Amino acid sequence: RAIVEHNAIIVENNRIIAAVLELIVRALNLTDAEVIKALIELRLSTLELVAATASLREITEELKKNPSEDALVEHNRAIVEHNAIIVENNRIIAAVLELIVG
Amino acid sequence: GSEVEILKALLELKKSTAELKRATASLRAITEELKKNPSEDALVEHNRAIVEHNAIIVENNRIIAAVLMLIVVAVGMTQEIKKALEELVASTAELKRATASLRAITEELKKNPSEDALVEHN
């Protein structure tokens, strides 16, 4: 349960960061094609992250209702895939910050 | 000399290649079989360590062979160097003979400065 709450928090945190990044890019009037592309990639990765998060929550609820060894291993796999998605989303956020700072 | 050392280096390349192919095959068998049940943690972690160890060994064998080929190429010139040395030794001995002859001529020319001695000097 704590892991699921943590992932929900990460998703909200990255949504907020993507929004603040858009505010920064607009406030600084940046036109660099690389930052615009990075923002597009970020938006797409946040869509993937939200959908994966919803899938993880549903899987966790199904595990809770009918706990089993097979359901538990499927849930753990869902978590590994979710963490991989979070890592990709953080990579994109890092790329955007690198472009803003540098 | 180098005729056998190089044959052994080729055998090494053959064996490290076969090792690489087999290590890769287990790399993949591991990914496909272990993702089926991630709870078998010891098996997947041990086999991944095995794969990394083999990959490192293969890379090291490649580098070692690359260095030994430089030693082998230096070795393969043994006969060319030996012949160059034989020529250099013969040249040194001839230079010594010419020097001794010139010294004797110098002494003869100074002691008895005949025109023939000047011709011999030149």
Query: How many Cβ atoms from other residues are within 10 Å of residue A1's Cβ?
Result: 7
DSSP secondary structure letters along A24-57: HHHHTT---HHHHHHHHHHHHHHHHHHHHHHHHH
A42 and A18 in contact (C-beta within 8 Å)?
Answer: yes
Nearest residue to A17 (alpha-carbon basis) of A67, A74, A92:
A92
Record: contact B39-A76, CB cut-off 8 A: yes
Structure tokens at B60: 């090291």
Asked if A2 has any chain B CB less than 8 Å from its own CB, the reply is no
Instruction: Judge whether A98 and A42 are in contact, CB under 8 Å.
Output: no
Q: What are phi and psi of A28, to 5 degrees?
A: -90, 0
Residue carrying structure tokens 């992932």: A7
Contacts of B39 in chain A (CB under 8 A): 69, 73, 76
CA B61 to chain centre: 16
Distance from CA of A73 to the nearest CA of B (A): 7
Cβ proximity of A35 and A99 under 8 Å: yes
Neighboring chain B residues of A73 at a CB cutoff of 8 Å: 37-39
| Binding-site residues on chain B for chain A (CB distance < 8 A) | 35, 37-39
Handedness of CA A15, A16, A17, A18 (dihedral sign): positive
What is the C-alpha end-to-end distance of chain B, expressed in Å?
Answer: 49
Test mutation, B36, B37, B44, chain A, max A CBs within 10 A: B37
Longest Cα separation, chain B:
109
Backbone phi, psi, residue B63, to 5°: -65, -45
Determine which helix (DSSP H) or strand (DSSP E) holds A3, and give its type and residue range: helix A2-27
How large is the C-alpha radius of gyration of chain B?
Answer: 34
Long-range Cβ pairs for the range B72-76 (8 Å, 24+): B72/B2, B72/B5, B72/B6, B72/B9, B75/B1, B75/B2, B75/B5, B76/B1, B76/B2
